Write the structure tokens for this entry.
Amino acid sequence: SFHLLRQQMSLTEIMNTGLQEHTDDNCLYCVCIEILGFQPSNQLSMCRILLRKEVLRLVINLSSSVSTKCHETGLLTIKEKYPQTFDDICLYSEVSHLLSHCTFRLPCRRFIQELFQDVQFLQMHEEAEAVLA
Amino acid sequence: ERNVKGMFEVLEPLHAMMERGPQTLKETSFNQAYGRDLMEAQEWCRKYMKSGNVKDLTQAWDLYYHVFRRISK
Ligand SMILES: [Zn+2]
């Protein structure tokens, strides 16, 4: 019901979880808490929950390939203004899951997976270090 | 206008007249060219109409835009 509210109210004025089908399974990180004794995920810096569904609705709008350049520009403005919103691994999990269940074009799919390139994923690596030794 | 029940009534008589079989050589040619995409798009539209989620409509509109771009050339 965010897709209907986003038609009349813009991005700057809405500023003044966001994953639809996210569970313990089908996530890059949330699977390992019960099996491997992973630490629970950190609390990030509702200031970021709205941007989560905003980037997800932009990617699912990018699947129809009607006007891909507008959503291209919107996703790149999201990346340039808030570069830490592409760091949560529970969002990378859902966007890869939606790429695994819809019909994306090849440059569009390359762009979506290229936005998640310059990421660190520090917490899952250090929890692998913690469960390792 | 974000009117899904408007575009449904727009393009379902086209699926209705395409479901009675081609009768000429031009209609058989159009069926052999675009009939699989115009069937899978209708299937995805029915999957959206049964359980409402834009995840099922985006693929149908992608197929429809592919058919439209191939027809318009
Ligand atoms: Zn997760």
Observations:
- The longest helix of chain A spans residues 68-81.
- The pocket of zinc ion is lined by residues A 22, 27, 29-30, 90, 93 (CB under 6 Å).
- Chain A has eight helices and no strands.
- Chain A touches chain B through 13 residues (CB under 8 Å).
